[PDB]
Design an enzyme around this catalytic site. Structure first.
Site, short mmCIF file in Angstrom:
data_model
loop_
_atom_site.label_atom_id
_atom_site.label_comp_id
_atom_site.label_asym_id
_atom_site.label_seq_id
_atom_site.Cartn_x
_atom_site.Cartn_y
_atom_site.Cartn_z
CG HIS A 167 -0.85 -22.75 3.14
ND1 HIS A 167 -0.88 -21.53 2.78
CD2 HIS A 167 -1.14 -23.47 2.10
CE1 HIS A 167 -1.37 -21.42 1.54
NE2 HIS A 167 -1.49 -22.81 1.08
CD1 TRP B 199 3.19 -14.45 6.45
CD2 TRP B 199 3.57 -13.14 4.74
NE1 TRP B 199 2.31 -14.90 5.40
CE2 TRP B 199 2.45 -14.12 4.10
CE3 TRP B 199 3.99 -12.25 3.76
CZ2 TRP B 199 1.81 -14.09 3.14
CZ3 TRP B 199 3.30 -12.31 2.34
CH2 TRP B 199 2.30 -13.22 2.36
CE1 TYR C 107 -0.25 -19.01 7.79
CE2 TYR C 107 0.59 -16.85 8.34
CZ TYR C 107 -0.04 -17.75 7.62
OH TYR C 107 -0.15 -17.34 6.10
CB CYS D 203 -2.10 -18.30 3.60
SG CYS D 203 -2.39 -19.02 5.14
CG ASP E 249 -2.74 -21.82 -2.25
OD1 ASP E 249 -2.62 -20.68 -1.89
OD2 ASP E 249 -1.72 -22.58 -1.68
#
Ligand code: GTP
Length: 685
Positions: free
Chosen positions: A332, A238, A513, A274, A355
């Site tokens: 997300h 990330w 993001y 994600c 998720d």
């Protein structure tokens, strides 16, 4: 005489019948709860019920069993009966017995070994017929994954491409993706992915049995993707530097990931985030048979540990200070799959939010769901599998505190924000966006909204404000492009008779993001801003390529922030907006007659939008049905600020029907530019 046979056909036909034709490579693949043809050929004399007794047996896991429904044996007859694993003569001619096997609507899914024994007189003959993979059946009214409409079956189980919505709530962008679930080897890999899961390691025969439930398989499949540590398909990252692998933004489908996983001894592939987690999850599930669709949520309250009230502490400029605060995710992503749900009160069939992005939890860190979407809408948090978590994602509230310089924290009004905007998934059978916000929430302040907030013990918002009758929003005027200079505006509106002299703090920062802010890429600070009565005022802010280029992320996202201070009554208005910078289109020409096992050519091009040269330029291309193989072309020379870059890929599509061709372009100064073309492939002869 002992009966003995030449060969088996397990057939091509069933593929059409079972909606698994592309999947039926060297193997037989069928969907549970549905008869399938099987023809036994015999040497000399045929089967005679007047003597020959054929009984069939099937076996799934490493520890098959009658009780675990992971083994079964059944006789050949004329009709049906009960137990649901049945074999039944359909026709005879010459020396070939033509017959039909049915498996139950809840048989577990996986690789099965189909064996046949006689018992013709006294002497027993006994041997291995073949193998077949048995999958979930969205066509089988009795199967738990059943959908009424063919359209939705087609979309959510059979379609190998689609869209991940990205960009920004105010400018929704649809990245194309090759889910390629029926691409060669991928089904085999999805099995390996369950034969390698934590629970299969604990028990094996227990897990093999539990794979009759789409809630199980869903929960396992999803969890395997990134969370659960040990073995796993993707390694997340990330911090914005991905040099030792492929960046998350660079994947155009979930096929390569899967093959790079298997082809390197099942090791975590370098670099997902994600939406990549989801797209892969979607692929595994579709492959196995659970209708699944990737979903995206804008302003997503992720990694908030269920907290329905987020608070932020912000300085005399509007800047968040809590380095022990979690930012709101610009977006997300997750997925939803479709199944009845027998393990909770009835009425919860439908979409379940799985998720596969690990979230810090009320104890440690793991995945989420399945949880009925309807529950999340209803406030029924008590419903199993992470309902308070999915709920926070879409319903969290946010308090912004500006800090007064004596220890005090003064409350600010922020309209530019509401968690859970614009929930998006591709329409069925079209390229349009469906907006599914309404499946998650009711409209604000409706009867039903507060009914649900009660069952979740949320309430505590809103019917409230401080009212100064000044508003502020961030305006962009027109669309703007990656590689450009451009303006955005702080838009203040004064709707009273008062004349205020104000302080206004404007700040643009590059962001990612998931919310990580970078350095500022433009600031304007005004200390005697004169807002005349009943008027409106637009304050310009120049954002320069030269200023966002160093730190801009592959998501092309810039956060504009503004704070208006009224000093006389000490009133604080906050306005924030995430911009998205457009990449150049990828022009795509399709050369030749699109035809099955006929060469096709794809011409691909874009024009350089930056004011500096592009080096290391590369196009990448794939699409289930269009190429068996990802294709790449490196362009040797720099592409200068003016010019264009164009090249041709050869394709050899092996399937008829509609396919999205999906193209990535990469380069030293310009990355993850995406493109897609819908190509219909016709018949050859
Ligand atoms: N490239 C890009 N274009 C955007 C973005 N947001 C909006 N646009 C486009 O810019 C134009 C303005 O959109 P709005 O959101 O209405 O612009 P605005 O300046 O906020 O004006 P109001 O809606 O009147 O407040 C529209 O054509 C949008 O499609 C963005 O984040 N990136």
């Amino acid at each position: 005489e002992l009966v003995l046979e030449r060969c088996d056909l397990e057939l091509e036909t069933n593929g059409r019948d079972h909606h698994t034709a592309d999947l039926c490579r060297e193997k037989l693949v069928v969907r549970r709860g549905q008869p399938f043809w099987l023809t036994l050929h015999f040497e000399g004399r045929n089967y005679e019920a007047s003597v020959d007794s054929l009984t069939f047996s099937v076996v799934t896991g490493p520890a098959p069993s009658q009780e675990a429904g992971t083994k079964a044996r059944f006789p050949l007859r004329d009709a049906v009966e009960e137990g649901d694993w049945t074999a039944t003569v359909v026709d005879q001619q010459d020396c070939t017995l033509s017959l039909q096997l049915t498996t139950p609507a809840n048989a577990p899914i996986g690789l099965y070994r189909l064996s046949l024994e006689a018992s013709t007189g006294y002497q027993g003959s006994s041997f291995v017929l073949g193998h077949f993979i048995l999958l979930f059946n969205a066509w089988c009214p009795a199967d738990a994954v059943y959908l009424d409409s063919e359209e939705e079956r087609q979309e959510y189980v059979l379609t190998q491409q689609g869209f991940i919505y990205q960009g920004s709530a105010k400018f929704i962008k649809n990245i194309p993706w090759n889910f390629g679930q029926f691409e060669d080897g991928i089904l085999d890999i999805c099995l390996i992915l369950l034969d390698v899961n934590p629970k299969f390691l604990k028990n094996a025969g227990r897990d093999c049995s539990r794979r009759s439930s789409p809630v199980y398989v869903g929960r396992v499949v999803s969890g395997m993707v990134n969370c659960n540590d040990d073995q796993g398909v993707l390694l997340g990252r990330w911090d914005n530097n991905y040099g030792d692998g492929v960046s998350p933004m660079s994947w155009i489908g979930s096929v390569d990931i899967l093959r790079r996983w298997k082809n390197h001894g099942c090791q975590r592939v370098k670099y997902g985030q994600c939406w990549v987690f989801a797209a892969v999850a979607c692929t595994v599930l579709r492959c196995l048979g659970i209708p699944t669709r990737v979903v995206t949520n804008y302003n997503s309250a992720h990694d908030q540990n269920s907290n329905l009230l987020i608070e932020y502490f912000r300085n005399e400029f509007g800047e968040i200070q809590g380095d022990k605060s979690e930012m709101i995710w610009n977006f997300h992503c997750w997925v939803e799959s479709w199944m009845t749900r027998p393990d909770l009160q009835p009425g919860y069939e439908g979409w379940q939010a799985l998720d596969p992005t690990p979230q810090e939890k009320s104890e440690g860190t793991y995945c989420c769901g399945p949880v009925p979407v309807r529950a999340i809408k209803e406030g029924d948090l008590s419903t199993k599998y992470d309902a308070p978590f999915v709920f926070a994602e879409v319903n969290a509230d946010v308090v912004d505190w500006i800090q007064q310089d004596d220890g005090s924290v003064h409350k600010s009004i922020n309209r530019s924000l509401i968690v859970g905007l614009k929930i998006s998934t591709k329409s069925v059978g079209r390229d349009e966006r469906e907006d599914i916000t309404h499946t998650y929430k009711y409209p604000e302040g409706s009867s039903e909204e507060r009914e649900a907030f009660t069952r979740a013990n949320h309430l505590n918002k809103l019917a409230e404000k401080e009212e100064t009758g000044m508003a502020m929003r961030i305006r962009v005027g027109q669309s703007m492009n990656m590689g450009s200079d451009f303006d955005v505006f702080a838009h203040i509106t004064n709707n009273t008779a008062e004349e205020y002299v104000c302080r206004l703090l404007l700040c643009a920062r590059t962001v990612s993001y998931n919310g990580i802010l970078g350095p500022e890429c433009g600031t304007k600070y005004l200390l005697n801003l004169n807002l005349e009565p009943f008027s409106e005022k637009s304050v310009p802010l120049c954002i320069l390529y030269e200023k966002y280029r160093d730190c801009l992320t592959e998501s092309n996202l810039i956060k504009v922030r503004a704070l208006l201070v009224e000093p006389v009554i000490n009133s604080y208005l906050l306005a924030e907006r995430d911009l998205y910078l457009e990449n150049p289109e990828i022009k795509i020409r399709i050369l030749g007659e699109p035809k099955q096992k006929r060469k096709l050519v794809a011409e691909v091009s874009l024009q350089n939008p930056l004011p500096v040269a592009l080096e290391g330029c590369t196009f990448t291309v794939e699409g289930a049905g269009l190429t068996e193989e990802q294709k790449t072309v490196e362009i040797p020379d720099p592409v200068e600020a003016g010019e264009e870059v164009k090249v041709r890929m050869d394709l050899l599509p092996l399937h008829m029907g509609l396919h999205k061709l999906v193209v990535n372009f990469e380069s030293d100064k310009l990355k993850a530019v995406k493109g897609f073309r819908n190509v219909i492939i016709g018949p050859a002869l």
